[PDB]
Design a protein around this ligand. Structure first.
Ligand code: NI
Length: 243
């Protein structure tokens, strides 16, 4: 095709149309599928990002385990790249009210996908039974705050994998582990997080009871952002999204 914009410009345009008369323009399901088709095509070289290797030395507290390249954002969506060093994870977290789509650029990530049980989805979340104990033991305040959940999947993804999609009510919690070296992925979220307006990134831990196939029910506890987890910016080297 002549006169085609960069792939990342086209992804940004499509995300904007997806998330925000005659002839009728596409609706949301068509737009989301087109967005997924564009992400399926995206390669690290399309963003001028070369695959990284050999984060050879142990990671001191001075250095961020994960870095972030900002590409674009509107009120409707955010668009950027997360780059995980060898042996690091983005800990389990949610995306309140949000859709998400990500695409691995290089390396391998294990993505564990979960949900809190939602009575709007025909579930009946129970309270933690009193005789239920965990390792480490739960403070009584924590017992009241435990949420039943479901661990749906825990697969490994590479650049060959299709994009990974989440919705407000399905696969809305995920953890992302870098497997066998550094890894990176492009992430689209809609709407973007907004701490100032009560749309936060919440972290969770899965509790380990005292006394196995997926899906399986789990107990979840909201937890602060881990002391050793942070994610600082670095320059984005790819084609610029205009304006
Ligand atoms: Ni996420």
């Amino acid at each position: 095709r002549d006169n085609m914009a960069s792939l990342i410009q086209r992804i940004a345009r499509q995300a904007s149309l997806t998330f925000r008369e005659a002839p009728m323009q596409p609706g949301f399901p068509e737009n989301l599928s087109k967005l997924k088709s564009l992400l399926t095509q995206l390669r690290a070289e399309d963003l001028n990002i070369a695959p990284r290797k050999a984060t050879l030395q142990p990671l001191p507290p001075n250095l961020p385990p994960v870095t972030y390249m900002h590409i674009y954002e509107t009120d409707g969506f955010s668009l950027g790249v997360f780059l995980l060093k060898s042996g690091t994870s983005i800990p389990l977290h949610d995306h309140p009210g949000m859709h998400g789509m990500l695409k691995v650029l290089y390396g391998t990530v294990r993505i564990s996908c979960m949900d809190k049980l939602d009575a709007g989805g025909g579930q009946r979340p129970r309270a933690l039974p009193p005789e239920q104990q965990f390792e480490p033991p739960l403070q009584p305040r924590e017992r009241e705050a435990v949420r039943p959940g479901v661990l749906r999947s825990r697969a490994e993804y590479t650049e060959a994998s299709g994009p990974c999609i989440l919705t407000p009510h399905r696969d809305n919690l995920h953890q992302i582990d870098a497997v066998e070296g550094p890894a990176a992925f492009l992430d689209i979220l809609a709407p973007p997080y907004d701490p100032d307006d009560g749309r936060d990134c919440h972290y969770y831990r899965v509790l380990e009871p005292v006394r196995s196939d997926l899906p399986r029910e789990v107990w979840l506890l909201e937890t602060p952002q881990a002391d050793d987890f942070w994610c600082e910016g670095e320059p984005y080297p790819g084609p610029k999204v205009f304006p």
